[PDB]
């Protein structure tokens, strides 16, 4: 079944179904049945939202690490999440005609030029979440959506497929995307997310995962100890970025220094990106949905 992780901000005004006026019912393809709703009260009174009503889902609520919040071009937010009579209500940024990044990844072969675009928007999104106090731990393609124009929309919430004899865990993630210090349950600083960013990059460029074993135990061992062959068809710039992200010591990883994501934005792999034009949504995606 599905587990949603809501990273709540300090002073979250908890909600309930009576706080939302119902406006439309949509079929949104991969998103299924979505309700368009209008917030009735509180600071965001009159705001329009998407609503999902899930019947078999668990809710986990976590504190951010950490002003009125502003929309980011490459993030969709979970604004409210509450349970009622066996139903889980999700109040989300409305994402008209959105789709899944995994759907695009299955259909296309990414070139380095393609990957530069998607990873650039994702780096802006991921760093913005860091500034809001959200560390992903197991950032993965399931967290990445695409809007109707083809731009990245990183979800600011967690989503896991968690299965009674099995004891429950407060954090259940996908091992293939977890940094070593996360695998060890010994650290989970924002630097862990830049390792996962590297896994994403590697998977986009090669269509394969860098660390994968027969079972979750062998994958852990590889993340901690394997020496990986760097694919030689990759450009010198792509190889350099992967090497700098795939440092086992989180303190030595690109993105972990004081300038954070700027260490990544300055890397030669992204040298063609105009980060201001990118933030203004003025650069067209390689694929249009």
């Amino acid at each position: 079944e599905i587990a949603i992780t809501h990273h709540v901000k300090e002073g979250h005004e908890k909600a309930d179904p009576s706080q939302f006026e119902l406006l439309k019912v949509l079929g949104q393809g991969s998103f299924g049945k979505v309700f368009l709703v209008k917030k009735i009260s509180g600071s965001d009174a009159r705001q329009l939202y998407a609503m999902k009503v899930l019947k078999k889902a668990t809710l986990k609520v976590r504190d951010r690490v950490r002003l009125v919040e502003v929309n980011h071009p490459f993030i969709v937010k979970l604004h409210y999440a509450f349970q009622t009579e066996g139903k889980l209500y999700l109040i989300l940024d409305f994402l008209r005609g959105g789709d899944l990044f995994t759907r695009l990844s299955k259909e296309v072969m990414f070139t380095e030029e393609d990957v530069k675009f998607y990873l650039a928007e994702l780096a802006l999104a991921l760093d913005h979440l860091h500034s809001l106090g959200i560390i992903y731990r197991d950032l993965k393609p399931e967290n990445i959506l695409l809007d109707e124009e083809g731009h990245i929309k990183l979800t600011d919430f967690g989503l896991s497929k968690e299965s009674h004899e099995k004891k429950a865990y407060s954090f259940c993630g996908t091992v293939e995307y977890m940094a070593p210090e996360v695998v060890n349950r010994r650290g989970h600083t924002q630097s862990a997310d830049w390792w996962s960013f590297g896994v994403l990059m590697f998977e986009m460029l090669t269509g394969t995962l860098p660390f994968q074993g027969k079972d979750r135990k062998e994958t852990m061992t590889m993340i901690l100890k394997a020496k990986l062959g760097m694919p030689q068809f990759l450009s010198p710039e792509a190889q350099s970025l992967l090497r700098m992200l795939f440092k086992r010591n989180p303190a030595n990883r690109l993105g972990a220094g004081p300038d954070g994501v700027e260490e990544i934005k300055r890397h030669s792999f992204f040298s063609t990106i105009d980060w201001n034009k990118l933030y203004r949504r003025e650069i067209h995606p390689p694929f249009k949905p």
Partner: peptide, 6 residues
Amino acid sequence: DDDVFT
């Protein structure tokens, strides 16, 4: 090893 590749 701190370096994963090479």
